[PDB]
Each structure stands twice: as C-alpha cells, then as structure tokens.
C-alpha cells in the first residue's frame, strides 16, 4: 500500500474556523502529532519555514488542497494530519506560479522516509480525484471524515 506505515487517528482530523491564519493552521494540525510524540516539539516551526520558502498549494479542482511538511529528520513516527477549513485560505502554488491557491483541505505529512514521500503524494493525488469525496469532506463531521479517509488508507 502507498499508505503503508502511516499512522492516522480520529484526533488527526479537525475543522478550523475562518479566522485561522496559514501559520496557525500548520500549528493546529501539528498539535496532535506533537502530543503523540510523532514529531519533534518544534515541528510546526519547521513546517512554517518550509511553507514560506517552498509552498505546497495544489490548484486542484473543485476543492483546493495543500500538503504542508518539512524535513524527515524532524519526524519520529509516520503520520498524516487532516484539516478542513471553513473558508478558503490562500497557499502559494507548489509549482511556482504567481497566483495563490484557495485551499479548503489540508493534508499535513509527517514522513520519516524521504523515499516514501512520492508514494503518499500519489495517494493524495489519487484520493482527491473523487470530486464527490472532496465535496463530502466540506460537509462531513470529524467522525465521518475519519472513517472515509481511514477506508482509503486501509485499501
């Protein structure tokens, strides 16, 4: 499985209200990973620095996505942390284009193996091809989201 060894809990799903900034989105998604010892305690600082310099916004349709992460040396155990944003938040375009990406779904990655990153990227880009699934993410509650993503991780 592309998602072999990736840890995922109900507590790794949260909704973030419209007030939250990009930095605080990153901090919020990092928070449960830090509590579970999945990453170093300043993990969010490093993801913020990464995002500022090498952004992770993907201009996919119909719902914009970002995939914030940092160096594998800051990761202790593999995890993904998912955020649903109440309103679009601009991330910069990963491919370096000038126009911002209005993002609603954030997949924070904590991967200990650099050589596994493209596997997880592949899974994300696969999962999001389901336009109906992406729409459901915007209306489902945290329990529903967990089960939906868990199923797609499991097989």
């Amino acid at each position, epitope marked *: 499985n592309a998602m072999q060894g990736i840890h995922f809990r109900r507590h790794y799903v949260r909704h973030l209200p419209k007030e939250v900034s990009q930095n605080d989105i990153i901090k919020a998604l990092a928070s449960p990973l830090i509590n579970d010892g999945m990453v170093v305690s300043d993990f969010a600082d490093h993801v913020i620095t*990464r995002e500022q310099n090498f952004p992770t916004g993907l201009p996919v349709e119909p719902v914009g996505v970002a995939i914030p992460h940092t160096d594998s040396k800051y990761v202790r155990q593999n995890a993904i942390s998912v955020g649903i944003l109440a309103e679009p938040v601009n991330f910069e375009d990963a491919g370096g284009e000038p126009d911002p990406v209005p993002v609603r779904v954030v997949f924070m990655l904590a991967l200990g193996n*650099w*050589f596994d990153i493209t596997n997880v*990227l592949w899974w994300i880009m696969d999962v999001i091809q389901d336009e109906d699934f992406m729409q459901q993410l915007l209306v489902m509650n945290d329990d529903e989201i967990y089960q939906s993503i868990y199923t797609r991780i499991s097989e």
Partner: antibody, heavy 126, light 109 residues
Framework: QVQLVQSGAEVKKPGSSVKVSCKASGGTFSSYAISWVRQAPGQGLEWMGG????????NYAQKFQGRVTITADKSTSTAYMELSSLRSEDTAVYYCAREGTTGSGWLGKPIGAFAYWGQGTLVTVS | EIVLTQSPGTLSLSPGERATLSCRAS???????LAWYQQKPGQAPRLLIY???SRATGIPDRFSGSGSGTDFTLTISRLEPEDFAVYYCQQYGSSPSTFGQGTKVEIKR
C-alpha cells in the same frame, strides 16, 4: 520508457563550481523523485541527494550539505546538481537517476528504487 | 548511518553456473526498501530487483532477489559472459540512501 539526458564532461579548476543538468523525458516530471549519485573512478556508488520537483526543495546527504545544491525546473523538465568548492576528491562520474513506477500510464505508483539512470557526466578537477 | 556489507568482494564462476551474492545490513531494513543493481563496464547501473524480491521491468527470471531483515541475497542463474559487472545492493528506507561496496562478478572461460 523515461529517458534521462545529462550535460557533457567538464574539466574544472580547484575551488570552482560545476552545474550538471539532467533533462527527463518520456514520463511525468513533477511528482516523482530524482536523485543524484556519484561514482569516483574505480569506486562505488554514493547517494548525494534528491528532489521531488513539485515540492521545490532537495534532500541532501550530510556529507554534501552546504557544498551541493540540487534544483529542478519544470519549464524544461530538467534537474540540476551544482557542486561548489571543487577538490581533487570530487573527480567522479555524476549520475542522475529517477524512481520507477508501476501500472499503466505515466502517473502510476512510485517504487523508490532507481529504475532510470542518466548516462553520467564526468567531472575532473585539475 | 546504515552500513551495507556485500560478500564476497569478488566472485569468479564458470558460464552456466549459479551465483549467490550476499548483502548484509548493520541494522534491520524493511524489505520494501532494498534494491539490487547491475553495473557493466562503462554503463550506468541497471535496476534488477526492488523491494527485495520484485524484478524490474524487462529483467529475466534468472535474476532473483530474496531475504529479509539484515540479510539479503541476489541469485544469478545460468551465468553468462555478459553478466560481467559489479552488483550493488541499496537501501532506501531513509535519507541518506546507502549502497553496498559492490560484488564484482567475473566469468571464467
């Protein structure tokens, strides 16, 4: 049938820098991992670092951190390796390499292992 | 780092014979992250095996990968003169990827 084509051999003076190119064709550029691997004459393979172009920044082996810069340019489907402050010990053939995939099409699941290799670029330091 | 140690350093065998190459890791490596390459003189390495036992596209059955944990093996059956090469194992279970020092396979008359 991804093809990786590298720039030509260079003779370099001690202390200088060299930038080697690796143009990738016949498959997807942005979302698959490209590595750089060096081989001193008569010696073994050393992984220097790698880049997933869409995410912009490279990962480096610490032996090469701060002397090697690895970049990618999507407009030309080309990856680069720049080595600075060249010494005698940097004389080598430098290879780019790219992971394989499975399944049909150009967007299949990646395998990590280096299915595709450039022809190598010889750098001698005089 | 993780050290891969290959044995023997050189293997001299007759054509037609069965060759066994060993790659030993200093700590356990998940089988998903172990590859074998063949490098013929003047060529780039050629991927033979990935994830310990999966043959790469176009690789014939006479190249076979096996093992787990700290001990992996590449077996070459019906050895050919054209198999003259250095064979490398590689782990990519974390950065940096590390390579074995290689086994040089020579084919006698």
């Amino acid at each position: 049938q991804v093809q990786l084509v590298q720039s030509g051999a260079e003779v370099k003076k001690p202390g200088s820098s060299v930038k080697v190119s690796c143009k990738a064709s016949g498959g997807t550029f942005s979302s698959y991992a490209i590595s750089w691997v060096r081989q001193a004459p008569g010696q073994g393979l050393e992984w220097m670092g790698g880049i997933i172009p869409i995410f912009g920044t490279a990962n480096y082996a610490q032996k090469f951190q701060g002397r090697v810069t690895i970049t990618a340019d999507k407009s030309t489907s080309t990856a680069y390796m720049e080595l600075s402050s060249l010494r005698s010990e940097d004389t080598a053939v430098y290879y780019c390499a790219r992971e394989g995939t499975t399944g049909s099409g150009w967007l299949g699941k990646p395998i990590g292992a280096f299915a595709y290799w450039g022809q190598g670029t010889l750098v001698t330091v005089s | 780092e993780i050290v891969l140690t290959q044995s023997p350093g050189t293997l001299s065998l007759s054509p037609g014979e069965r060759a066994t190459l060993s790659c030993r890791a200093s700590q356990s490596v998940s089988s998903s992250y172990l590859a074998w390459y063949q490098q013929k003189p003047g060529q780039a390495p050629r991927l033979l095996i990935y994830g310990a036992s999966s043959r790469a596209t176009g690789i014939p059955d006479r190249f076979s990968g096996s093992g787990s944990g700290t001990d992996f093996t590449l077996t070459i059956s019906r050895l050919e003169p054209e198999d003259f090469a250095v064979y490398y194992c590689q782990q990519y279970g974390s950065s940096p990827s590390t390579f074995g020092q290689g086994t040089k396979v020579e084919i006698k008359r």
